[PDB]
Amino acid sequence: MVKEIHVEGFEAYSKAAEENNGKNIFALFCGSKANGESWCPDCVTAEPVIARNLKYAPADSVFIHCSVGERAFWKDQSNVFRKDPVLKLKCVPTLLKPGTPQRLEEEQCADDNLVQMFFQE
Amino acid sequence: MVKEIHVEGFEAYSKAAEENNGKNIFALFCGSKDANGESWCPDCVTAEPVIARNLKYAPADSVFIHCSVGERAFWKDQSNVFRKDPVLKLKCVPTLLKPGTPQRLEEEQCADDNLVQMFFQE
Amino acid sequence: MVKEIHVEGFEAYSKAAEENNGKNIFALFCGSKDANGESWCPDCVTAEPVIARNLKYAPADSVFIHCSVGERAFWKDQSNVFRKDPVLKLKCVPTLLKPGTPQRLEEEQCADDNLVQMFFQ
Amino acid sequence: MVKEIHVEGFEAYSKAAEENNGKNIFALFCGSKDANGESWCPDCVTAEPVIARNLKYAPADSVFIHCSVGERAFWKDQSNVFRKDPVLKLKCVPTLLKPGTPQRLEEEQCADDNLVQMFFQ
């Protein structure tokens, strides 16, 4: 297993990221959950692909699962995730290694080989 | 210097990419320029010199493909061949990408001197 | 002008249709737009102006429901509520239909000026 | 209907213009359409239907000249006959112009329904 952190919203994400700033951080940005209905279909498709490829990450990695909030919050073009100078999120799902060019979006987050490449190097 | 190819449109990109498939390819996708070198894509204008002075960080034997996607009116079409390509999946210009990898920069990140260095660096 | 309702998703369409059940209902089913006003459905983009300039041919008290079915990822789901509804039985976007009738146009026929006129007139 | 002339290239355009010099001429300059295919000019393709549906606003005597300037490579030549012509002074395609007047629309303005109606009226 790889360490995983589950956060809801930008403040909770920021705390997790700042407390792991010394580590190999991978982050998935996805829509919030009717508990057991995500509003983001491509998020739901990505989760299991990401889950089965996390083993390819280097041993002491940290996986942050970040729920961005409700669809209406996410649709706000000026929301904190879209305007963050490092995250610069354009959509959910996004898989990213913060502060690097390593990014996958939408259907690419369910692409088994690209997700393996993302975690492995 | 690093080998550079300058291509205009999808079929010309496709030829360069397929003839260099055995090589370490970096690609920049930008708006086409006018007859005075004038560009409709302001973020593309900004990115060009940052990318130019960081290419030296790419490995030896890299190939840099400078791809003009065409006019604004071509690019504005949400169904254009660059956006629908299953590998490129372009969402905006400028895009800096290693095709078939997670290595991608978009818009103002293409003019970020440290992210562009990191993108080329190996 | 003809009365127009703009709805997003199945629940909002269902409200509009049930509150207009005593009226002459025309419905367009289209891919959802981005903040950018931009569409993932190119046949939907081509149809809206054709439909906009032919709506004047509808009987004066008609009700035109513009229904955004959701994102591509929602629509691609072959079992989604729009495709499975017993009355709508949507097979594609765009679809122009008078619910519970044989009157239906799909894909490029929604940008056919004479067939769109015929649909409303 | 309004009289229309379809010409390919400068010499053909010059013959149509000179043979109609007594008349109210409107001219559209667009890219050539390659064999079995559309043009290389997307803004030309967008303009054509807007222009076609507003031509009825033109006055009595009117003549509409549809002029293909040639291939993209010819057009991109900054010294080509259309760009250098002392009356046409073309800067881009599409261009809608009443030769020898200040009446001119370019690029996206050629698909602006109200500016095109105004140009013909």
Topology:
4 copies of one chain form a homotetramer.
Chain A: E1 3-8, H1 10-19, E2 25-30, H2 41-53, E3 62-67, H3 71-75, H4 80-83, E4 94-96, E5 103-105, H5 112-120
Parallel strand pairs in A: 1-3, 2-3
Antiparallel strand pairs in A: 2-4, 4-5
PDB class: electron transport
Keywords: Oncomelania hupensis, Redox regulation, Immunological properties, electron transport
Assembly: tetrameric
Question: What do these coordinates show?
Answer:
- Four copies of one chain form a homotetramer.
- Chain A has 121 residues and is α/β, with parallel strands linked by helices.
- Chain A has one domain (1-121).
- Chain A has helices at 10-19, 41-53, 71-75, 80-83, 112-120, and strands spanning 3-8, 25-30, 62-67, 94-96, 103-105.
- Chains in contact: A-B, A-C, B-C, B-D.
- The A-B interface holds A 88, 90, 95, 100-108, 114, 117-118 and B 89, 91, 96, 100-109, 115, 118-119.
